[PDB]
């Protein structure tokens, strides 16, 4: 009974997320240990903040003066795992997680619930909210060293990174190759700034546009890193087809995502990837795909999976893959 | 890191609550172990139900899928009633969505339920007979035994009549009537609830000893009594409202009468009161002040939870 109640408790994660959002652990580490000072710094009502703190003590994140535990220290804004931002309700991902309150609808329909809560589908909501666009892009350790090392660039003149975020993958590849990042409004500006500040602006450019439209140029390698999981099969096939049509002769499409058999691993990795797969369902109608589902998606786009390079890791983000696709 | 991610995960409790809402474990126990059959019984999309099942396996509620010993606690007939307490169509798990706006409650000290559902808690139940009934059944889910200890924490020898103010389905009045055959009692409750209290007390064979009045415990109470009961009532109310209720009870005491308040690290219950109702759990010193504002004094406290016995000051 205690196990079930713990698994089912909605209050504990919302208390953690509220503490992250209020930056409570940052304020304590900066010398606000008392409720009166912490209530001033967080702009909260002191009696209610103490009731929040009581739960944070009960679950082991805090211990009239309060300090973080070793686990609570991970909510410090400068901790390398960045768990404060990933739990911050004002930033894109924990905000999107509220969509899980309508999880029954998503299981009933297979369709995302984010629009029903926030008024627009995911990327269109970000397009109207520059703060959320920027926090989404910053949330997504630019992590691309191993996938860049898993491909032979000898015969590659130009790389097109489709949906390439702030440009970290293109940069890892750059470190004879030139590259282009294709991205959405807003994101293109932070990609350009990142690439300039890496000293790579003469090797990597950035184009604003829509990867459902004809791609801006041809390339020898076209990258889809954590893109296709955001889309249902029919959209994923459209993106793959745009990429296929943009390949130079002998070119390849590189997919950087999860591509395992549905077995193996541990309950810990099972859980971690269950969360990602369910986030794609609820936020976007997308999904993680097994190695076998990749074969079918590829065939619908006129492609074949030529090779799957394993990118192992026993710790988060665990084992990933680089799939290499060629025209069929 | 793993501990923090587990504590912070909204996904797992919503997967549990979705399984409870879909009555998934009941359908498995009733023969549907495969996704095709379970999708049909739950009226869900099979590929998405499988993704839900994968999470339920990873967290150890399921393991052709069958419930684990923990998952079996989501059977609808299990006496701890955890399926209904996690059911998003019933009152409490529905109210728990208020926690998605917990930062607002911490900022203001005010409930977030009305901002989500359009009306404050008891007004919403008053317009939704299904939610009113499921709330009453959730709290009364063990009322045949849960009031034996508070009833035995008080001596009924010189009590003639009991008034249970906000008495739910009547379980406390019934436990007192079984403890003390000489007492009569009255339950005061809201619309809807009074009908299921009347039915419960009739089916206990107590209808000649316990009656039920529909009314509002912020108004003059319907009669006087030697013992007036407030069981898990005052925690629903901010201080000024709790004082009003206590004062109405004080006005209705017979000479020599007493008010009985029936009310681990509880932070969940306290935060639920904040977000649902603006209420709170109270420590002893706070009870002393509330009592004093209503013209009362705390005469004795019995550990059971507690039973506080209040007398006119
Ligand atoms: C923490 C691991 C990872 O960063 C992997 C994964 O993180 C990315 C970036 C990450 N970063 C260090 C650049 C790293 O390269 C990793 C291998 O890939 C990932 C994550 C999360 C999301 C997403 C992720 O791709 C999303 O794509 C995503 C999205 O496209 C739309 C909405 C939400 C999300 C995500 O929440 C993360 C994840 O799997 O969390 C369980
Ligand atoms: C699970 C423990 C408990 O049943 C204690 C507590 O439940 C106890 C006492 C309760 N009572 C009728 C004696 C009953 O016997 C139940 C099975 O166990 C409790 C609970 C929950 C509520 C409430 C609780 O009292 C409420 O009163 C309540 C309310 O008045 C209005 C809105 C919501 C609620 C509640 O959600 C529960 C709780 O503390 O959850 C954290
Ligand atoms: C940030 S995630 C993956 C980013 C990056 N490739 C990585 O691995 O971290 C998916 C990206 O697809 C982009 N995107 C979504 N729809 C798009 C579209 N129609 N055209 C171009 N980019 C799009 C989003 O802006 C987002 O940055
Ligand atoms: C169910 S909880 C506690 C019930 C019961 N005494 C117990 O211990 O389980 C609080 C009760 O207060 C009742 N209540 C709320 N506002 C009321 C009001 N103004 N007048 C009478 N009853 C009210 C609700 O209907 C609800 O049943």
Short mmCIF file of C-alpha atoms in Angstrom, two decimals, chain A residues 32-300:
data_model
loop_
_atom_site.label_atom_id
_atom_site.label_comp_id
_atom_site.label_asym_id
_atom_site.label_seq_id
_atom_site.Cartn_x
_atom_site.Cartn_y
_atom_site.Cartn_z
CA UNK A 32 18.45 32.81 3.14
CA UNK A 33 17.91 29.94 5.58
CA UNK A 34 14.88 31.39 7.41
CA UNK A 35 11.32 31.43 6.14
CA UNK A 36 11.03 35.20 6.51
CA UNK A 37 14.07 35.83 4.28
CA UNK A 38 13.17 33.03 1.86
CA UNK A 39 9.59 34.26 1.58
CA UNK A 40 10.93 37.71 0.73
CA UNK A 41 13.35 36.39 -1.90
CA UNK A 42 10.79 34.08 -3.54
CA UNK A 43 7.92 36.61 -3.22
CA UNK A 44 5.70 34.08 -1.41
CA UNK A 45 3.46 34.08 1.62
CA UNK A 46 5.57 32.97 4.63
CA UNK A 47 2.97 30.62 6.20
CA UNK A 48 2.40 28.80 2.90
CA UNK A 49 6.10 28.65 2.09
CA UNK A 50 6.71 26.94 5.43
CA UNK A 51 4.08 24.34 4.54
CA UNK A 52 5.92 23.74 1.26
CA UNK A 53 9.19 23.44 3.18
CA UNK A 54 7.61 20.88 5.53
CA UNK A 55 7.01 18.59 2.55
CA UNK A 56 10.49 19.24 1.17
CA UNK A 57 11.86 18.12 4.55
CA UNK A 58 9.59 15.06 4.62
CA UNK A 59 10.84 13.87 1.18
CA UNK A 60 14.50 14.54 1.98
CA UNK A 61 15.38 17.61 -0.13
CA UNK A 62 15.72 20.01 2.82
CA UNK A 63 16.68 19.65 6.45
CA UNK A 64 13.68 28.01 11.65
CA UNK A 65 16.75 27.51 9.42
CA UNK A 66 16.71 25.13 6.46
CA UNK A 67 19.53 23.76 4.31
CA UNK A 68 19.57 21.44 1.28
CA UNK A 69 20.41 17.80 1.59
CA UNK A 70 22.78 16.13 -0.86
CA UNK A 71 19.77 15.41 -3.08
CA UNK A 72 18.38 18.93 -2.65
CA UNK A 73 21.72 20.38 -3.73
CA UNK A 74 20.93 19.12 -7.25
CA UNK A 75 18.36 21.96 -7.52
CA UNK A 76 21.12 24.55 -7.40
CA UNK A 77 20.92 26.41 -10.71
CA UNK A 78 24.62 25.71 -11.46
CA UNK A 79 24.60 21.98 -10.88
CA UNK A 80 25.83 20.18 -14.05
CA UNK A 81 22.76 17.94 -14.38
CA UNK A 82 20.62 21.11 -14.74
CA UNK A 83 17.71 19.54 -12.85
CA UNK A 84 16.45 22.96 -11.63
CA UNK A 85 15.67 24.12 -15.19
CA UNK A 86 14.22 20.74 -16.14
CA UNK A 87 11.78 21.06 -13.23
CA UNK A 88 11.05 24.82 -13.66
CA UNK A 89 7.35 25.39 -14.46
CA UNK A 90 8.18 28.69 -16.21
CA UNK A 91 10.47 26.85 -18.67
CA UNK A 92 9.30 24.85 -21.66
CA UNK A 93 9.61 21.21 -20.55
CA UNK A 94 8.09 21.24 -17.07
CA UNK A 95 5.42 23.58 -18.44
CA UNK A 96 4.67 21.03 -21.17
CA UNK A 97 4.58 18.22 -18.58
CA UNK A 98 1.31 19.67 -17.26
CA UNK A 99 -0.14 18.03 -20.42
CA UNK A 100 0.15 14.74 -18.52
CA UNK A 101 -2.85 15.82 -16.44
CA UNK A 102 -4.86 14.78 -19.50
CA UNK A 103 -3.00 11.51 -20.08
CA UNK A 104 -6.27 9.50 -20.30
CA UNK A 105 -7.25 11.50 -23.39
CA UNK A 106 -3.92 10.75 -25.06
CA UNK A 107 -4.31 7.02 -24.36
CA UNK A 108 -7.89 7.17 -25.73
CA UNK A 109 -7.02 9.03 -28.93
CA UNK A 110 -3.30 8.65 -29.54
CA UNK A 111 -3.30 12.44 -29.95
CA UNK A 112 -1.35 15.06 -27.95
CA UNK A 113 -3.04 17.01 -25.16
CA UNK A 114 -0.72 20.04 -25.11
CA UNK A 115 -2.89 22.16 -27.42
CA UNK A 116 -5.96 21.53 -25.29
CA UNK A 117 -4.13 23.07 -22.30
CA UNK A 118 -2.06 25.83 -23.87
CA UNK A 119 -4.05 26.76 -26.98
CA UNK A 120 -1.55 25.90 -29.75
CA UNK A 121 0.44 22.80 -30.73
CA UNK A 122 3.89 22.58 -29.16
CA UNK A 123 6.16 24.31 -31.71
CA UNK A 124 3.54 26.91 -32.61
CA UNK A 125 3.20 27.79 -28.92
CA UNK A 126 6.98 28.20 -28.71
CA UNK A 127 6.89 30.34 -31.86
CA UNK A 128 4.59 32.79 -30.09
CA UNK A 129 6.50 32.81 -26.79
CA UNK A 130 10.16 33.76 -27.21
CA UNK A 131 10.88 32.98 -23.53
CA UNK A 132 9.67 29.40 -23.96
CA UNK A 133 11.41 29.04 -27.32
CA UNK A 134 14.68 30.11 -25.68
CA UNK A 135 14.28 27.91 -22.59
CA UNK A 136 13.39 24.91 -24.76
CA UNK A 137 16.50 25.43 -26.84
CA UNK A 138 18.75 25.91 -23.81
CA UNK A 139 17.36 22.86 -22.06
CA UNK A 140 18.12 20.64 -25.00
CA UNK A 141 25.55 19.87 -22.61
CA UNK A 142 26.09 20.44 -26.39
CA UNK A 143 27.12 15.50 -26.04
CA UNK A 144 27.71 15.35 -29.81
CA UNK A 145 31.33 14.13 -29.62
CA UNK A 146 30.40 10.41 -29.69
CA UNK A 147 27.86 10.63 -32.57
CA UNK A 148 30.27 12.80 -34.58
CA UNK A 149 33.02 10.24 -33.94
CA UNK A 150 30.75 7.39 -35.12
CA UNK A 151 30.77 8.52 -38.76
CA UNK A 152 33.59 8.70 -41.30
CA UNK A 153 33.67 12.26 -42.70
CA UNK A 154 36.48 11.61 -45.24
CA UNK A 155 34.23 11.77 -48.30
CA UNK A 156 31.91 14.46 -46.92
CA UNK A 157 32.08 18.01 -48.27
CA UNK A 158 28.91 19.43 -46.74
CA UNK A 159 26.61 18.48 -43.86
CA UNK A 160 23.01 19.68 -43.46
CA UNK A 161 21.71 19.40 -39.87
CA UNK A 162 17.93 19.44 -40.19
CA UNK A 163 16.30 20.73 -37.02
CA UNK A 164 19.79 21.13 -35.58
CA UNK A 165 19.03 23.11 -32.44
CA UNK A 166 21.72 25.53 -31.39
CA UNK A 167 24.22 23.91 -33.76
CA UNK A 168 26.15 21.72 -31.32
CA UNK A 169 26.16 18.69 -33.64
CA UNK A 170 27.34 20.68 -36.66
CA UNK A 171 30.05 22.18 -34.43
CA UNK A 172 31.22 18.80 -33.17
CA UNK A 173 31.50 17.63 -36.76
CA UNK A 174 33.34 20.80 -37.74
CA UNK A 175 35.95 20.30 -35.00
CA UNK A 176 37.49 20.04 -44.28
CA UNK A 177 33.69 19.85 -43.77
CA UNK A 178 31.31 22.78 -44.08
CA UNK A 179 27.86 22.61 -42.55
CA UNK A 180 24.45 24.24 -42.55
CA UNK A 181 21.93 24.19 -39.69
CA UNK A 182 18.25 24.42 -40.68
CA UNK A 183 16.06 25.65 -37.80
CA UNK A 184 13.00 27.63 -36.73
CA UNK A 185 12.68 31.36 -36.03
CA UNK A 186 14.32 32.36 -32.78
CA UNK A 187 16.45 29.22 -32.54
CA UNK A 188 18.36 30.33 -35.63
CA UNK A 189 19.59 33.43 -33.77
CA UNK A 190 20.97 31.48 -30.82
CA UNK A 191 22.52 28.92 -33.16
CA UNK A 192 24.25 31.72 -35.07
CA UNK A 193 25.50 33.24 -31.81
CA UNK A 194 26.74 29.87 -30.51
CA UNK A 195 28.56 29.13 -33.74
CA UNK A 196 30.12 32.62 -33.87
CA UNK A 197 31.29 32.30 -30.28
CA UNK A 198 32.88 28.93 -31.09
CA UNK A 199 34.83 30.63 -33.89
CA UNK A 200 33.04 28.47 -36.46
CA UNK A 201 30.96 31.02 -38.33
CA UNK A 202 33.11 30.63 -41.46
CA UNK A 203 32.46 26.85 -41.42
CA UNK A 204 28.81 26.54 -40.30
CA UNK A 205 25.94 28.71 -41.43
CA UNK A 206 22.31 28.75 -40.31
CA UNK A 207 19.15 28.94 -42.42
CA UNK A 208 15.66 29.68 -41.10
CA UNK A 209 12.94 27.55 -42.61
CA UNK A 210 10.65 24.55 -42.50
CA UNK A 211 11.88 20.99 -42.99
CA UNK A 212 8.52 19.99 -44.49
CA UNK A 213 9.38 22.27 -47.43
CA UNK A 214 12.08 21.58 -50.01
CA UNK A 215 15.36 21.77 -48.13
CA UNK A 216 17.60 24.84 -48.70
CA UNK A 217 20.48 22.90 -50.27
CA UNK A 218 21.92 19.47 -51.04
CA UNK A 219 24.49 17.72 -48.86
CA UNK A 220 26.59 14.58 -48.55
CA UNK A 221 25.29 13.88 -45.05
CA UNK A 222 21.94 15.05 -43.69
CA UNK A 223 21.42 14.76 -39.93
CA UNK A 224 18.16 14.23 -38.02
CA UNK A 225 19.12 14.30 -34.33
CA UNK A 226 16.15 13.90 -31.95
CA UNK A 227 13.81 15.22 -34.63
CA UNK A 228 11.79 12.28 -35.91
CA UNK A 229 10.56 11.24 -32.44
CA UNK A 230 8.54 14.45 -32.36
CA UNK A 231 6.42 13.30 -35.25
CA UNK A 232 3.80 10.74 -36.18
CA UNK A 233 4.80 8.27 -38.89
CA UNK A 234 3.27 10.20 -41.78
CA UNK A 235 5.12 13.41 -40.86
CA UNK A 236 8.33 11.53 -40.15
CA UNK A 237 8.09 10.01 -43.63
CA UNK A 238 7.62 13.50 -45.12
CA UNK A 239 10.75 14.77 -43.39
CA UNK A 240 12.73 11.70 -44.47
CA UNK A 241 11.58 12.21 -48.03
CA UNK A 242 12.67 15.87 -48.06
CA UNK A 243 16.04 14.69 -46.83
CA UNK A 244 16.29 11.94 -49.43
CA UNK A 245 15.54 14.45 -52.19
CA UNK A 246 18.34 16.67 -50.93
CA UNK A 247 21.09 14.01 -50.91
CA UNK A 248 24.08 14.46 -53.16
CA UNK A 249 25.00 11.25 -55.02
CA UNK A 250 26.50 8.80 -52.54
CA UNK A 251 25.05 10.81 -49.65
CA UNK A 252 23.53 9.41 -46.47
CA UNK A 253 20.92 10.40 -43.90
CA UNK A 254 22.10 10.10 -40.29
CA UNK A 255 19.44 9.62 -37.58
CA UNK A 256 20.57 10.22 -34.00
CA UNK A 257 18.04 8.78 -31.57
CA UNK A 258 17.03 5.56 -29.83
CA UNK A 259 16.96 2.45 -32.05
CA UNK A 260 17.02 -0.67 -29.86
CA UNK A 261 15.01 -3.85 -29.74
CA UNK A 262 12.09 -3.54 -27.29
CA UNK A 263 13.90 -5.83 -24.79
CA UNK A 264 17.14 -5.59 -22.81
CA UNK A 265 18.28 -2.82 -20.48
CA UNK A 266 17.20 -2.38 -16.88
CA UNK A 267 14.05 -1.10 -15.24
CA UNK A 268 15.93 2.20 -14.77
CA UNK A 269 16.54 2.73 -18.49
CA UNK A 270 13.09 1.33 -19.29
CA UNK A 271 11.60 4.05 -17.09
CA UNK A 272 13.76 6.82 -18.50
CA UNK A 273 12.80 6.01 -22.07
CA UNK A 274 9.18 5.40 -21.13
CA UNK A 275 9.07 9.02 -19.94
CA UNK A 276 10.59 10.27 -23.19
CA UNK A 277 8.19 8.17 -25.29
CA UNK A 278 5.17 9.28 -23.31
CA UNK A 279 6.32 12.92 -23.49
CA UNK A 280 6.38 12.59 -27.25
CA UNK A 281 2.84 11.17 -27.21
CA UNK A 282 1.39 13.82 -24.94
CA UNK A 283 3.29 16.86 -26.25
CA UNK A 284 3.50 16.08 -29.94
CA UNK A 285 1.83 12.81 -30.98
CA UNK A 286 5.32 11.44 -31.69
CA UNK A 287 7.02 8.31 -30.42
CA UNK A 288 10.22 6.40 -29.91
CA UNK A 289 10.74 3.73 -32.54
CA UNK A 290 12.29 0.29 -32.29
CA UNK A 291 15.01 -0.86 -34.64
CA UNK A 292 12.33 -2.75 -36.57
CA UNK A 293 9.99 0.23 -36.89
CA UNK A 294 12.91 2.22 -38.36
CA UNK A 295 13.15 -0.31 -41.20
CA UNK A 296 9.52 0.33 -42.16
CA UNK A 297 9.73 4.11 -41.89
CA UNK A 298 12.84 4.06 -44.06
CA UNK A 299 11.13 1.92 -46.69
CA UNK A 300 8.14 4.27 -46.85
#
